[PDB]
């Protein structure tokens, strides 16, 4: 494998059509996660309208987060009240914690983690995989956490299941339902060329992370990146992996 120096503490990059490693490093390793969990609720969010279970136009109230530093969309907008389109495109796209929460809870109410936790056994993710929240904010001291191979079945699996996810993932700015436009955490996007997703994260603990995919040639590759030291390392990393991803 390549020589690379990362600020990763975990890090790899994956093809995607034979799941094979082209880097890795700590791929084992459990790490926290944080808002890379968001993924996760995505997934059960696609397979609930699939299900007939769940409106893309259903309007919820945003739930008021435990923590008022965290990233929110009631905070930049002042509207309590949102489809669930919109707010899976906040989850997505701005990292909208609240959007995650309010997602989660009308799903499955109280029971949303377990549900989280039979979806990880369900697309392969180890034993070392467990989600605490929608969001992936802590609950009750517990903390998300994950491998980078884990990561990558899940993000393989989600994009493989629900290719949809793309069209959201892949825009720089999302025009929501409502009128408001929320701006990607994605600074990549039209930076490396096929890349279209997937997924930023940080907290103090889990240091500044990003699941990044890019398509060429019929070619699709999956990067995670885990505890990079700043926001903009976490990219640079990532442009290290995409090039080794299509070597
Ligand atoms: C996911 O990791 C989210 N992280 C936080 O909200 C950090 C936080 C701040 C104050 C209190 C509690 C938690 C969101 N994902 C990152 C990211 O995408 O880089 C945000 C910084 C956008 S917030």
Known sequence: ?????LSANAAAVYSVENGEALYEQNADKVMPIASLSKLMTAFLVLEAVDNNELSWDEKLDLVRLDDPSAVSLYAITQKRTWSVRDLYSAMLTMSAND???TLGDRLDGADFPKEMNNQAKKLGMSSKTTFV?????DVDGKSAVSTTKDLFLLSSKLISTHPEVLETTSKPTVTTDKGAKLESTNDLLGSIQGLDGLKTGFTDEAGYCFIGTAERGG????SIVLDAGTAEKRFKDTEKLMEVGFK
Not at 1 to 5: A, E, F, G
């Open 1 to 5: 494998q390549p020589n690379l120096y």
């Open 99 to 101: 959007a995650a929460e």
């Open 219 to 222: 070619k699709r590759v999956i």
């Open 133 to 137: 929240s929608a969001s992936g904010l």
